[PDB]
């Protein structure tokens, strides 16, 4: 349910 610290929200 959370975003991990290495998730990339960018293109």
């Amino acid at each position, epitope marked *: 349910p959370n975003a*991990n*610290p*290495n*998730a990339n929200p*960018n*293109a």
Partner: T-cell receptor
Amino acid sequence: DVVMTQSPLSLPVTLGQPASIFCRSSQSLVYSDGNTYLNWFQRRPGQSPRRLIYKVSDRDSGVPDRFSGSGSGTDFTLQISRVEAEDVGVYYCMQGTHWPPTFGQGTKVEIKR
Amino acid sequence: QVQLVESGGGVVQPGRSLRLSCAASGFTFSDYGMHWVRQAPGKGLEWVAIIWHDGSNKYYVDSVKGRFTISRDNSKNTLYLQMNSLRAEDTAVYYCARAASSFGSGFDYWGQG
């Protein structure tokens, strides 16, 4: 939520002298990918806030080289090598390793003149 | 040349709604995720929400889940925060901020709030 404890809360500094701001996290900020997600931010009078440092020690565009970051695990330091008049403001650490990201309370830098 | 400008702040009655906007310029807006962050009396800085570059994922701090909705219109270079069910705890300066390519590194540019 991880608690970020900064010290000191007020930092009076003579122009041209160094300054150190300390941050301790309530849990280690090392992540399983090998990175430590510890960031520093600056708020200045009249300006939008901006990031200064990410991943403990990497410096952002437009940030003078007198700013540097160090530390590991739970303990981190923002260093200003020679404080300038334009560095007055409030400095915040922020951890991003644990959910949700959390900020320290801020350290206010002021110049003794 | 990156610029972020928030608008829509004002008074709102408890339980009612308010929409905030953030106008982006100076970069390719659709290439970047976007955050909201707030600074409330006695709380300091608090991360609020993130939206992916394409709107495909959205995350929220627990206390605003079920109350706030983040959205964006890439063709208009605008980010939105729809705030419903407002609470006294919500009085704050709201900032939008441009996402880092790792969530744990936060965001680099912010608006003035």
